[PDB]
Amino acid sequence: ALLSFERKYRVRGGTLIGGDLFDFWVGPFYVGFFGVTTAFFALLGTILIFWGASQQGTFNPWLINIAPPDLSYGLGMAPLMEGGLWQIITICAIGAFVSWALREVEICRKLGMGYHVPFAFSVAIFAYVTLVVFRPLLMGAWGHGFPYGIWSHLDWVSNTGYAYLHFHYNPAHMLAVTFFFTTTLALALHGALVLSAANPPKGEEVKGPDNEDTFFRDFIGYSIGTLGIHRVGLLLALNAGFWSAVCIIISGPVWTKGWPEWWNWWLEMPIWP
Amino acid sequence: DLSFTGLTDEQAQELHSVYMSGLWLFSAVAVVAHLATFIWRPWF
Amino acid sequence: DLSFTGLTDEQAQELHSVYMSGLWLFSAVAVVAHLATFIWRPWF
Amino acid sequence: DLSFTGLTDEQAQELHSVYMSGLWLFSAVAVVAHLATFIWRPWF
Amino acid sequence: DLSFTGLTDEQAQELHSVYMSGLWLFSAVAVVAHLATFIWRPWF
Amino acid sequence: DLSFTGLTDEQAQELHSVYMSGLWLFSAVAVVAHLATFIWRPWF
Amino acid sequence: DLSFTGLTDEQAQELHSVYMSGLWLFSAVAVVAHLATFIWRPWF
Amino acid sequence: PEYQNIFTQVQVQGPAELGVDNENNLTEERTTGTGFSQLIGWIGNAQLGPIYLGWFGIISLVTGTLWFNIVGFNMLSQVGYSIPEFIRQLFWLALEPPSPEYGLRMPPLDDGGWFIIASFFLLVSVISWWLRTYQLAEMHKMGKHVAWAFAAAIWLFLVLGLFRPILMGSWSEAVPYGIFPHLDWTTAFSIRYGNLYYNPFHALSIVFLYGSVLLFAMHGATILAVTRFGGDRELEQIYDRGTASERAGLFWRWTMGFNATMEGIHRWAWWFAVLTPITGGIGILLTGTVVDNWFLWAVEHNFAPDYTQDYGYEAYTTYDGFLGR
Amino acid sequence: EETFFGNFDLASLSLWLFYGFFALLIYYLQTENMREGYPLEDEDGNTAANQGPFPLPKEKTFKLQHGRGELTLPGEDVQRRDNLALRKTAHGNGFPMEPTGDPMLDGVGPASWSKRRDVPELDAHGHPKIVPMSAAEGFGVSAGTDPRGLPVMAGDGEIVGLVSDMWIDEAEQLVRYLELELDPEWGDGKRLVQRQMVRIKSDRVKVRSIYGKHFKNVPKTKSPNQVTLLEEDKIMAYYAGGTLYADESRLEPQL
Amino acid sequence: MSKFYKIWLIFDPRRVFVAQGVFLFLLAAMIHLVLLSTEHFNWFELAAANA
Amino acid sequence: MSKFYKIWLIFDPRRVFVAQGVFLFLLAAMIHLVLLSTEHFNWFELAAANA
Amino acid sequence: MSKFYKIWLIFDPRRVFVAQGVFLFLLAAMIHLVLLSTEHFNWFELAAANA
Amino acid sequence: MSKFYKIWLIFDPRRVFVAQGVFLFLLAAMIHLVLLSTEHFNWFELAAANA
Amino acid sequence: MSKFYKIWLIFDPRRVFVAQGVFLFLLAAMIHLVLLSTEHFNWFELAAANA
Ligand code: BCL
Ligand code: BCL
Ligand SMILES: CC[C@H]1c2cc3[nH]c4c(c3C)C(=O)[C@H](C(=O)OC)c4c3nc(cc4[nH]c(cc(n2)[C@@H]1C)c(C(C)=O)c4C)[C@@H](C)[C@@H]3CCC(=O)OC/C=C(\C)CCC[C@H](C)CCC[C@H](C)CCCC(C)C
Ligand SMILES: CC[C@H]1c2cc3[nH]c4c(c3C)C(=O)[C@H](C(=O)OC)c4c3nc(cc4[nH]c(cc(n2)[C@@H]1C)c(C(C)=O)c4C)[C@@H](C)[C@@H]3CCC(=O)OC/C=C(\C)CCC[C@H](C)CCC[C@H](C)CCCC(C)C
Ligand SMILES: COC(C)(C)C(=O)C/C=C(\C)CC/C=C(\C)CC/C=C(\C)CCCC/C(C)=C/CCC(C)CC/C=C(\C)CCC=C(C)C
Ligand SMILES: COC(C)(C)C(=O)C/C=C(\C)CC/C=C(\C)CC/C=C(\C)CCCC/C(C)=C/CCC(C)CC/C=C(\C)CCC=C(C)C
Ligand SMILES: COC(C)(C)C(=O)C/C=C(\C)CC/C=C(\C)CC/C=C(\C)CCCC/C(C)=C/CCC(C)CC/C=C(\C)CCC=C(C)C
Ligand SMILES: COC(C)(C)C(=O)C/C=C(\C)CC/C=C(\C)CC/C=C(\C)CCCC/C(C)=C/CCC(C)CC/C=C(\C)CCC=C(C)C
Ligand SMILES: COC(C)(C)C(=O)C/C=C(\C)CC/C=C(\C)CC/C=C(\C)CCCC/C(C)=C/CCC(C)CC/C=C(\C)CCC=C(C)C
Ligand SMILES: COC(C)(C)C(=O)C/C=C(\C)CC/C=C(\C)CC/C=C(\C)CCCC/C(C)=C/CCC(C)CC/C=C(\C)CCC=C(C)C
Ligand SMILES: COC(C)(C)C(=O)C/C=C(\C)CC/C=C(\C)CC/C=C(\C)CCCC/C(C)=C/CC[C@H](C)CC/C=C(\C)CCC=C(C)C
Ligand SMILES: COC(C)(C)C(=O)C/C=C(\C)CC/C=C(\C)CC/C=C(\C)CCCC/C(C)=C\CCC(C)CC/C=C(\C)CCC=C(C)C
Ligand SMILES: [Fe+3]
């Protein structure tokens, strides 16, 4: 089933690899080389998770937990029932995420658009890879990654935060939190302004961009425009992701003491009496 | 005759012959390698 | 006659014949492998 | 005559015959498997 | 007459008759299963 | 007359008749079930 | 005349006359409920 | 490569836009005077000003300035009026809520009176600002979506500072006014009542915050990628559909199996953002008044994980082995 | 605090109420997004037998400015194209379509346009929104590099003409289009390019999407002072179709 | 008194009915639960500690 | 009471039927669950103890 | 009861059939799982104990 | 019933076949995995113990 | 059973073949990996211990 305007866009071509060996649709979904790889990796990972759950002893979604190996194994391969399953599932997840991004690139190419969406997804992929690959590699053990469980991956965050004592004193954490809050506020304001323009009180005509510009200059004295708001939102979200990755990567391999101690450079500058 | 790729029957036969030849050569090399490895360090 | 794909009766019969020829060979190979594995290490 | 899918009465009968044959074959295989398993390890 | 879906009366009558046949067969199988279960392990 | 849904009086009367029949059947089954339960384990 | 809903005086009269019967019946059921509850377990 | 439309290639400047008007006569209260900034013109509009001056805006400005000055002068007096030491310890100072022994009574100025006065002024300022944002939309003949989304954040603000201390019966339950001192309050609040992770409404709030950031990333990238078809003019695309909207919908339909409209994406965005403070406030209001230990609650409701291995370093290594001796 | 039954306290009741509310909200949000493009069809143009899990919404009405009337949605697809030069490559569903003639000239594929109104977009005063710079009072270049007079470079590396003017958006103070004057060897008349497909350098302007021989077939405007919505859709679709149809190597797999 | 029919000239009959249906169900549920919370009027536990 | 059929001149039956079905099933499930949290009316435990 | 067939003049059969198909399987799975959570009606543990 | 063949006048066979294949495979995998979570019916562990 | 060839009048082989190819390799990898996580059937460890 197609939308009323969809048929004229479903043309052949625009693939990075494969040609027309995989150039078709299944329902609404587009299939390609990277669709095939995505299906393989995602299905294998999910089935392996459920096999590990059956061998653990519980099928409760809240209670399933698949964990990385002990620190004494270093960077080698562990027995499959003591941490190897986590490593295999990690490999599957990385493959699946990269395949998803490349499939998005192929769809963008076929539709004649820019490649902003795959680029934006790459930052989330980068944060995940920093969490599970780069930090354990620098720290020297695969056992530093977080476990795969709905409620057990919060205990990891808690214990990792309290291992540097007071984690709110991390400056990069401060920057990331600020970016998150500002992104949410901007999204609320943008949605509200567009809806208010398009949906006036009953019996009234609709409004235009001049009206929106006037509301915000009256409200706060400045208006960013209908093109600047999208740039600003994208930049804020990407900065949030990037600084989250930086804040986690500096906690283990670069700083070892508690985070309040870091501000001693400010507290003891020579310029003070 | 049914064809989605535009090839004919004769062309498909001729291509399949060479493809089978390559497959058999690959398999023979792999068999020799597996025999040597088993002699060196046997599983099973 | 009902045909969502555009094929005729004879084309479907030919395709099914070749497909089942492939299926039976796959199954025979798997049966031989399973018998050898059971002789090596039984699971019943 | 009511038809959402565009099929006809005779086409639906012809399709249903083959569908039911496949269902019965699947069920027969499942019954034999369940009987072998019950003889191996009873659950009642 | 009033009809939100587009069917007539005869089509609705036929559809409901077949639906009722299916419901009765389902219920009969469920009843047999419940009776066997009660004989095996009685509640109440 | 007043109508927000687009029906006429006769259609509403017929619909209400069928709805009341369904409601009474549901209520009768529930009453029999409640009587059996009270005999099995009385409350009050 | 003032009418913020668009209905006429007679329509409102009939609607209220129908609504009051349902209100009275709902109240009547509640009296029989509260009369049996008191006998079972008084609260005064 | 192709132009990516992040910074404008060339800028143009004309007469300043003073704004639209109607019978409500908005021009009467507007300031005269505008400026142009070429540095911010690379990313958005360059014009600065003018602004609207009403009663609500002036009241809000005065009360907020008073709150700021009260906090600042208390912090300055707490250090001996020494300016270099005031600068040295700026991030560590605060104006502190009253002691628990005073209940809801008025405390002395030394032990929370100034805190109460500052809180009253801040509350007046915020409510006046909300009134101004409502009145402007009423006078522009537009919808009231901005006011309703500001009211959703004001709900969590009020729950944190007013409603919960009244329900618990003590003004000592509020938040201190300081930078490092309010991050100390956050951590201590989490520790005092078990683990705030196991509060299901905190988890729902996190769900909605993560989702709103994800949605803004998606929407910004998508609109920037169809700008070559004039996609940034969203209102005209709502009134008269074009190929930008069709391509934007078909991308996500072919990606994940369903899509939105040009007008319907903003409804999704509006709800995901507003649902964050609402669930957060519901979660905060239930803590201490209903539930006192969230981990024990999770144990009772059977969603706390269980661990089999042992605790302590001597089950994994040796003190000499760690030191390398 | 006490429990009504078992472990049921106020928190559990609040949680279940939120679950119900969220289900209703999800239904509402999904339904509000089905006002364009429904009902669904198959690849032959007929109504599909499957229509989904969610029923269609009720109708809403807009009131447009400058006396354009009303818009009620959902309704009939008034932006639909009539004769498409496309062909099917399979007897069933789920396979691509193949262009019949020239996809760039026929407006199919990534070269597709939608049938918008044949009138210009207006500002709050009721005037055309996009105007050539030669007829805008008090406007001028304030930063960046002025592109007027610089030569234009094609995607294959050919010089086709010079930039003669810019068309700006007066209400939002932004440049929308670049106007070119074609050399006699590469066509006649003037053409427009959207600002989002060009790169302005110190000595030239570069357009990479289409080649030198494609510049004479760019759709033209009817008037030298304004452009309608249809014309804009047709012009921008033409420029975007070249990212796939300008060269045979842009369509075949890259590997 | 007998002029109470005029209420339907101000309020729309549909939404008032919906609101009364919801409010009445919630009221009945709350009253049944508040009675269950006590000890003299709990019928499950009274039936348990009777036989 | 003879004029109760006019409710279908106000409410659309298509929405009413769906709402009623959801409400009836949820109510029945909730009552059955409440019965299973007691000790005098839990038929599974009653069967276990009886044997 | 003889006019119950008119429900198909109100509800679309395709959506109803899909919804019922999902509902019946979910209900059956829930009931089997509820049985497995008891001590008296768990047939795997019974099979283990009887052997 | 001899009129059951009319289900194909309402549902498209192409979509029903795909849904049935997915459902059947997932159900089989679920059952096979439920068996392996017990001690009495885990055939790998029984094989290990019998040696 | 003799009319099973008519499935190719419903489904195009081009989609079916890729679906089957993905499914079979997924199954093989899953089964080999499941065997490799036991003690009795892990052939790599059996070879090491036997020496
Ligand atoms: C004691 C606990 C410490 C603490 C410990 C930590 C630690 C430790 C960490 C942070 C991290 C974060 N902290 Mg902190 N933090 C604390 C208190 C707070 C508070 C607060 C008090 O209000 C806030 C607002 C935050 C918030 C934050 C963010 C700045 C950051 C979250 C990462 C992120 O969003 O990356 C988002 C990116 C991702 C990882 C998402 C990846 C997505 C992938 C690519 C896609 C998956 C697809 C999926 C499988 C598909 C499924 C759907 C299909 C249908 C199947 N912290 C306390 C004080 N904080 C985390 C961080 O920054 O790590 C990077 C972190 O590790
Ligand atoms: C050790 C720390 C505890 C913890 C303690 C808390 C506490 C305590 C709280 C949060 C709360 C929140 N937590 Mg938590 N939280 C922890 C760890 C985390 C982690 C993580 C580890 O990844 C994350 C991502 C979060 C995330 C969150 C947010 C989802 C949520 C805040 C809601 C919001 O919208 O804020 C946005 C903030 C606001 C809208 C506040 C109101 C702002 C008003 C409108 C400002 C008015 C204007 C001003 C006065 C004038 C300025 C003047 C100008 C110059 C003009 N928490 C750990 C477990 N969390 C809050 C919540 O809701 O909990 C349920 C909360 O109270
Ligand atoms: C993040 C959103 C917050 C916000 C921010 C904000 N306020 C702003 C701006 C912004 C982004 C301006 O651009 C505008 C301004 O001119 O800032 C310098 C302004 C402003 N709106 C204000 C009021 C105001 N808005 C408020 C609200 C808010 N606006 C939000 C809380 C509040 C509060 C917190 O209650 C107040 C008090 C002042 C802060 C300032 C006053 C501007 C004005 O009166 O008219 C417009 C400007 C002119 C008179 C002409 C230029 C002179 C400028 C005041 C200085 C800069 C000129 C310089 C040549 C350019 C340098 C670049 C600038 C960006 C700094
Ligand atoms: C949906 C929830 C999200 C949200 C929404 C939200 N916030 C909002 C709104 C909305 C919809 C507004 O409409 C409103 C607004 O004005 O936005 C521009 C606002 C707002 N959200 C704000 C803050 C804020 N929101 C936050 C969070 C959030 N806001 C959530 C993520 C947070 C945090 C902690 O995350 C903060 C800190 C303000 C910027 C603004 C409310 C402004 C207000 O109420 O001001 C009252 C006035 C005063 C107290 C006067 C202060 C006096 C100053 C000392 C000087 C004068 C002001 C001057 C301009 C500043 C100094 C400038 C220097 C250059 C001198
Ligand atoms: C142990 O457990 C784990 C999971 C770890 C595993 O390891 C599991 C592993 C598996 C389950 C593995 C499964 C592996 C397979 C199914 C492998 C299959 C491999 C093949 C079918 C290989 C085929 C190779 C064929 C080749 C090489 C053919 C031809 C090569 C040529 C060079 C021929 C050239 C042809 C020409 C020139 C034709 C030109 C003709 C004209 C007319 C132009
Ligand atoms: C034990 O518990 C766990 C969960 C761990 C399990 O392991 C559970 C496992 C299962 C539940 C497993 C279930 C497995 C199945 C249902 C498997 C089914 C397998 C098949 C149906 C396999 C079919 C294979 C068919 C093949 C190979 C057919 C043909 C192959 C060909 C190469 C034929 C090629 C045909 C041509 C060229 C036709 C061309 C003809 C023309 C005329 C053009
Ligand atoms: C104990 O406490 C707890 C909570 C744990 C519980 O377990 C509580 C449980 C409940 C309260 C459960 C309640 C359960 C129900 C109310 C269940 C109701 C079930 C039904 C009404 C089922 C009906 C099924 C009907 C069927 C299958 C009928 C027919 C199907 C077909 C006929 C298929 C064929 C259709 C065709 C051919 C269409 C014909 C088309 C034409 C054009 C003629
Ligand atoms: C804990 O204990 C405490 C005391 C704290 C409490 O719990 C406090 C409780 C209270 C304070 C409770 C208060 C309760 C009330 C005030 C209750 C009031 C109830 C009513 C007014 C009920 C009215 C019901 C009316 C009904 C049922 C009428 C009609 C129903 C119909 C279905 C029929 C209507 C049909 C129509 C109109 C057809 C339309 C006709 C046309 C011609 C179009
Ligand atoms: C949605 O909006 C609109 C406008 C449509 C409405 O408002 C709609 C409203 C409705 C559709 C409302 C519907 C309401 C009902 C269906 C209500 C039904 C109420 C009952 C059936 C109540 C029954 C109550 C019974 C009680 C309380 C019984 C108590 C019994 C005892 C305490 C036992 C005491 C023992 C005795 C009497 C011994 C008996 C001995 C004998 C010899 C007989
Ligand atoms: C003890 O305390 C606690 C809180 C624990 C409780 O448990 C409290 C419980 C309550 C407060 C419970 C309250 C319960 C109610 C008020 C229940 C009310 C129930 C009903 C009103 C039920 C109505 C059922 C009606 C039915 C089943 C009707 C069926 C109709 C049909 C099948 C016919 C359909 C109609 C057609 C086809 C129209 C014909 C079509 C044409 C086109 C002519
Ligand atoms: C124990 O508790 C738990 C929860 C753990 C459980 O395990 C609970 C489990 C359940 C509740 C399970 C319930 C399971 C079911 C209800 C299963 C039902 C299964 C079926 C009805 C399966 C039917 C399969 C039918 C098939 C495969 C039939 C035929 C297929 C074909 C014939 C293919 C060929 C088709 C052709 C050629 C048609 C073309 C014809 C033309 C004329 C063109
Ligand atoms: C002296 O030097 C000068 C003059 C330059 C200064 O003025 C310098 C000033 C400073 C350096 C100031 C610095 C100020 C800060 C760092 C302030 C930080 C403030 C916060 C982080 C504040 C958080 C506040 C509130 C929070 C977290 C939540 C909720 C609060 C409220 C709802 C408050 C509302 C209170 C009410 C309603 C109680 C009122 C009581 C009544 C009885 C009406
Ligand atoms: Fe937008």
The DSSP-derived string for H24-61 is: T-GGGGB----EE-TTGGGTS--EE---B--HHHHHHH
Q: 3-class DSSP state for residue I24? A: helix
Q: Which ligand is nearest to the CA of H174?
A: 12
Q: Where are the beta strands (DSSP E) in chain G?
A: none
Q: Which residue of D has its CA nearest to L43?
A: D43
Long-range contacts of H53-60 (CB under 8 A, 24+ apart): H53/H29, H54/H29, H54/H132, H54/H135, H56/H128, H56/H129, H56/H131, H56/H132, H56/H135, H57/H128, H57/H129, H57/H132, H59/H124, H59/H125, H59/H128, H60/H124, H60/H125, H60/H126, H60/H128, H60/H129, H60/H132
Among I110, I172, I182, residue whose Cα is nearest residue I151: I182
Placement of tokens 């056992």 in the chain: A143
Interchain touch L–I (≥3 Cβ pairs closer than 8 Å):
yes
| Cβ–Cβ below 8 Å for J12 and G5 | yes
Calculate the CA dihedral of residues K13, K14, K20, K23 and round it to 10 degrees. Answer: -150
Residue E25 tokens, joined: 């067969």
Among A9, B5, A15, residue whose Cα is nearest residue I249: A15
Q: Is the four-CA dihedral C26, C32, C33, C38 of positive or negative sign?
A: positive
Out of M33, M34, M37, name the one closest to residue A57 (CB).
M37
Residue closest by Cα to atom 28 of ligand 9: G33
Q: Contacts of residue E44 in chain F, CB cutoff 8 Å?
A: 40
Residues A109, A11 contacting (CB under 8 angstroms): no
Among H43, H228, H222, H244, residue whose Cα is nearest residue A120: H222
Which positions in chain D have a beta carbon within 8 angstroms of at least one beta carbon in chain E? 2, 44
Q: b or e along K11-39 (b: 16 or more beta carbons within 10 Å of the residue's beta carbon)?
A: bebeeeeeeeeeeeeeeeeeeeebeeeee
According to the annotation, is F43 in a ligand binding site? yes
N-term to C-term CA, chain M: 53
d(CA H157, CA H276): 12
Residues N10, M14 contacting (CB under 8 angstroms): yes
d(CA N26, CA A46): 12
| Cβ–Cβ below 8 Å for D22 and N4 | yes
Give the ligand 3 atom nearest the CA of H60.
35
Give the ligand 7 atom nearest the CA of M5.
37
Q: 3-class DSSP state for residue I168? A: strand
d(CA H324, CA H314): 15
**Cβ < 6 Å from ligand 5: which residues?**
B 14-15, 18-19, 22-23, 26; N 28-29, 32-33
Amino acid letter, I215: F
Among A224, I42, I232, residue whose Cα is nearest residue H240: I232
Cβ-Cβ pairs closer than 8 A, C with D, add up to: 6
Q: Contacts of residue B42 in chain N, CB cutoff 8 Å?
A: 47
d(CA J7, CA G4): 10
User: Which residues are registered as beta bridge partners of L37?
Assistant: none
Interchain touch M–E (≥3 Cβ pairs closer than 8 Å):
yes
Q: 3-class DSSP state for residue E3? A: coil
Q: How far apart, in Å, are the Cα atoms of A170 and each of A167, G7, N48?
A: 6, 67, 49
Amino acid letter, H3: Y
Residue I96 tokens, joined: 């691509």
Q: How far apart, in Å, are the Cα atoms of N16 and each of A1, D23, N11, N12, N20?
A: 19, 20, 7, 7, 6
Q: Contacts of residue K44 in chain L, CB cutoff 8 Å?
A: 38, 40-41
Among I209, I154, I216, I211, residue whose Cα is nearest residue I185: I216
G interface mutation test: which of K2, K3, K8, K9 has the most G CBs within 10 A? K3
Phi-psi region of I138 (alpha: psi -120 to 50; beta: other; left: phi over 0): left
Q: 3-class DSSP state for residue H98? A: coil
Residues A213, A225 contacting (CB under 8 angstroms): yes
d(CA A49, CA I140): 63
Among I56, I58, I60, residue whose Cα is nearest residue I72: I60
| Cβ–Cβ below 8 Å for F44 and J14 | no
Q: Which ligand is nearest to the CA of H232?
A: 13
Residues H136, A218 contacting (CB under 8 angstroms): yes
According to the annotation, is N28 in a ligand binding site? yes
User: Which residues are registered as beta bridge partners of I140?
Assistant: H13
d(CA A68, CA A82): 8
Placement of tokens 């084309």 in the chain: C11
d(CA I236, CA I246): 15
d(CA A10, CA I108): 9
- What is the gyration radius of the CA atoms in chain E, in angstroms? 18
- Which among L15, L16, L20, L34 is the best mutation to test ligand 7's pocket, defined by most ligand atoms within 8 Å of the CB? L20
Amino acid letter, L28: A
Cβ–Cβ contact N39 with I under 8 A: no
Is residue N5 in contact with ligand 11, taking CB distance under 6 Å? no
DSSP per-residue string spanning I68-123 = --EEEES---TT--S---EEESSSSSS--EEESS-HHHHT-GGG------SS--B-
| Alpha helices (runs of H) in chain B, residue ranges in sequence order | 9-40
| Cβ–Cβ below 8 Å for E25 and M1 | yes
Give, as one character, the DSSP assignment of residue I50.
-
Q: How far apart, in Å, are the Cα atoms of H126 and each of F34, H66, H115?
A: 58, 13, 17
Q: Which residue of L has its CA nearest to F19?
A: L4
Helix axes H145-158, A171-198, angle to 10 degrees: 140
**Cβ < 6 Å from ligand 7: which residues?**
D 2; E 14-15, 18-19, 22-23, 26; K 28-29, 32-33; L 27, 31, 34; M 4, 6-7, 9-10
Bridge-based pairing state of the strands I151-153 and I205-206: parallel
Long-range contacts of N37-43 (CB under 8 A, 24+ apart): N37/A51, N37/A55, N37/A80, N37/A81, N37/A84, N37/A85, N38/M44, N38/M48, N39/M48, N40/C41, N40/M44, N40/M47, N40/M48, N40/M51, N41/C41, N41/C43, N41/M44, N41/M47, N43/B43, N43/B44
d(CA A251, CA A266): 20
Q: Which ligand is nearest to the CA of G16?
A: 8
Residues N18, A36 contacting (CB under 8 angstroms): yes
Residue closest by Cα to atom 33 of ligand 12: H161
Q: Is the four-CA dihedral B1, B2, B4, B10 of positive or negative sign?
A: negative
H interface mutation test: which of A183, A236, A239, A266 has the most H CBs within 10 A? A183
d(CA L20, CA E23): 12
Out of M14, M17, M48, name the one closest to residue N39 (CB).
M48
**Cβ < 6 Å from ligand 4: which residues?**
A 181, 184-185, 188-189, 220; H 60-61, 64-65, 68, 125-126, 129, 133, 146, 149-150, 152-153, 273-274, 276-277
The 3-state secondary structure of J3-50, one letter per residue: CHHHHHHCCCHHHHHHHHHHHHHHHHHHHHHHHHHCCCCCHHHHHHCC
Placement of tokens 């060897």 in the chain: I185
Amino acid letter, A55: Q
Q: How far apart, in Å, are the Cα atoms of K43 and each of F2, F41, F43, H109, H194?
A: 52, 10, 15, 65, 37
Placement of tokens 């201390």 in the chain: H165
d(CA I227, CA I204): 26
d(CA J5, CA H63): 51
d(CA E8, CA E4): 10
Residue closest by Cα to atom 48 of ligand 2: H126
Among A88, A77, B27, residue whose Cα is nearest residue N32: A88
d(CA I97, CA A10): 6
d(CA A102, CA A35): 9
Q: Contacts of residue N6 in chain D, CB cutoff 8 Å?
A: 18
d(CA H269, CA C11): 53
Residues I156, I189 contacting (CB under 8 angstroms): no
Q: Which ligand is nearest to the CA of J7?
A: 8
d(CA H219, CA I189): 39
Give, as one character, the DSSP assignment of residue I190.
E
Q: How far apart, in Å, are the Cα atoms of E32 and each of A192, D24, E20, L31, L33?
A: 60, 21, 19, 17, 21
Q: How far apart, in Å, are the Cα atoms of I44 and each of A1, A4, A7, C6?
A: 10, 12, 9, 14
Residue closest by Cα to atom 13 of ligand 8: J27
Residues E34, D29 contacting (CB under 8 angstroms): no
d(CA H164, CA H158): 9
DSSP per-residue string spanning I203-243 = S-EE--SS-GGGGGGS---SSSS---HHHHHHHHHHHHHHH
Is residue C12 in contact with ligand 6, taking CB distance under 6 Å? no
Cβ–Cβ contact M43 with C under 8 A: yes
| Alpha helices (runs of H) in chain C, residue ranges in sequence order | 9-40
Ligand 6 centroid – CA C16 distance (Å): 14
Chains in contact with M, where contact requires at least 3 CB pairs less than 8 Å apart: A, C, D, E, I, L, N
Helix axes A85-111, A33-56, angle to 10 degrees: 150
User: Which residues are registered as beta bridge partners of I128?
Assistant: I122
Interchain touch B–J (≥3 Cβ pairs closer than 8 Å):
no
Residues H162, H155 contacting (CB under 8 angstroms): no
Give, as one character, the DSSP assignment of residue I53.
S
Phi-psi region of I149 (alpha: psi -120 to 50; beta: other; left: phi over 0): left
d(CA I168, CA H12): 8
Residues A93, A131 contacting (CB under 8 angstroms): no
Q: Which residues contact H50 (CB under 8 A, 6 or more apart)?
A: A217, A221, H18, H19, H30, H31, H32, H33, H34
Residue I93 tokens, joined: 């569903």
Instruction: Kindly report the number of other CB atoms within 10 A of residue H254's CB atom.
Output: 23
Give the ligand 12 atom nearest the CA of H75.
1
Residue closest by Cα to atom 17 of ligand 6: N24
User: Resolution to 1 decimal, in Å?
Assistant: 2.4
Residue I122 tokens, joined: 């207006």
Q: How far apart, in Å, are the Cα atoms of H162 and each of H131, H166, N47?
A: 19, 6, 71
Distance from CA of K49 to the nearest CA of F (A): 16
Find how far residue A1's CA is from the centre of its chain: 32
Give, as one character, the DSSP assignment of residue A151.
T
Q: How far apart, in Å, are the Cα atoms of A34 and each of H126, H202, I138?
A: 52, 37, 54
d(CA I246, CA I250): 7
Residues I215, I160 contacting (CB under 8 angstroms): yes
d(CA H278, CA H267): 17
Half-sphere exposure of B6 (CA within 13 A, CB side): 1
